[PDB]
Amino acid sequence: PQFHVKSGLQIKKNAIIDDYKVTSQVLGLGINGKVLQIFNKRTQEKFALKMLQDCPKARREVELHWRASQCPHIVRIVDVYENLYAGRKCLLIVMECLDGGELFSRIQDRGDQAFTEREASEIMKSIGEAIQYLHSINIAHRDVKPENLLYTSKRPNAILKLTDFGFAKETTCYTPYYVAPEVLGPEKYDKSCDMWSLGVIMYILLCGYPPFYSNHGLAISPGMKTRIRMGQYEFPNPEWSEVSEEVKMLIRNLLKTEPTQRMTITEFMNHPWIMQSTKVPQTPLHTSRVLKEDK
Numbered sequence: 001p002q003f004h005v006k007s008g009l010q011i012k013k014n015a016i017i018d019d020y021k022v023t024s025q026v027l028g029l030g031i032n033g034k035v036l037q038i039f040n041k042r043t044q045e046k047f048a049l050k051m052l053q054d055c056p057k058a059r060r061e062v063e064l065h066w067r068a069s070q071c072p073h074i075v076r077i078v079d080v081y082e083n084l085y086a087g088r089k090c091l092l093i094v095m096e097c098l099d100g101g102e103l104f105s106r107i108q109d110r111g112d113q114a115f116t117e118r119e120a121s122e123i124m125k126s127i128g129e130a131i132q133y134l135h136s137i138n139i140a141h142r143d144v145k146p147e148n149l150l151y152t153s154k155r156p157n158a159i160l161k162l163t164d165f166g167f168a169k170e171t172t173c174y175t176p177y178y179v180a181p182e183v184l185g186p187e188k189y190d191k192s193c194d195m196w197s198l199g200v201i202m203y204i205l206l207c208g209y210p211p212f213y214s215n216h217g218l219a220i221s222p223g224m225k226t227r228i229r230m231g232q233y234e235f236p237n238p239e240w241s242e243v244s245e246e247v248k249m250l251i252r253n254l255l256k257t258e259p260t261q262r263m264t265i266t267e268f269m270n271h272p273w274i275m276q277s278t279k280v281p282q283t284p285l286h287t288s289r290v291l292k293e294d295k
């Protein structure tokens with residue numbers, strides 16, 4: 001006994017409206033247009049619905065995302081319909097619904113507490129688990145941005161989840177103990193960008209602005225673009241003046257220009273600042289206030 005097998009992906013073919021109420025309310029915009037809010041007729045719970053045109057690229061997204069839904073920090077696909085819509089075959093993905101909206105909106109909507117270093121570590125921890133899960137099953141997510149980190153609720157014990165698989169990609173014997181990873185097949189620097197994303201999201205969490213900011217004109221967005229190439233960014237005071245040299249070093253290691261230089265997800269999770277989420281200094285960060293400065 002003891003055989004943990006979860007179930008396979010099942011493309012439902014009946015009309016989705018047979019099983020759910022479909023609203024006009026929008027929950028997100030993508031290249032495939034709207035994410036809608038819907039309601040399960042039976043249970044009456046709320047779900048997000050993403051609609052893609054059926055085709056090989058769409059199918060992969062679904063498949064990868066289904067594969068990854070077993071991860072606690074990745075938006076769970078709850079079921080998938082293939083229907084006809086204007087004589088065009090379609091994939092309708094029904095996922096769990098993340099009311100807490102986007103990661104940054106939440107921080108920026110404190111302003112009456114203060115957002116500690118430790119709170120950020122915990123955040124980065126949970127994004128890490130998501131990447132970790134992904135990479136260990138040989139998927140690179142490849143669009144890990146702010147916009148795709150949302151919260152299950154407004155409740156402060158909300159759990160933070162990764163969404164959007166439109167750019168995810170697969171990365172893919174008896175004397176094996178000693179064989180070097182490079183001999184176990186190709187897989188060229190592909191999951192390493194997920195690592196860069198992580199650096200950026202960490203930078204912003206700690207201060208409230210990207211490490212590579214625009215400016216507009218010339219050498220200010222064409223230059224903002226070489227700024228990235230050169231890997232040039234500061235830790236300007238007085239935001240960073242109070243931040244652990246250990247943390248700076250961690251960002252520095254994620255924001256490495258040459259991808260093979262950059263840290264692995266595994267190395268990441270074993271890092272003390274991430275591994276001791278709990279015992280990180282309670283120190284007050286500017287983040288929330290700085291965020292409030294915008295459009």
Ligand SMILES: O=C1NCCc2[nH]c(-c3ccnc(-c4cnc5ccccc5c4)c3)cc21
Nearest residue numbers: 027028029030035048097098099101163164
């Ligand atoms: O895959 C995607 N591509 C485009 C952006 C996006 N949002 C979602 C999404 C998924 C699940 N829930 C939501 C969501 C739910 N409820 C919300 C309430 C208030 C603000 C944002 C919300 C987002 C968005 C998925 C995708």
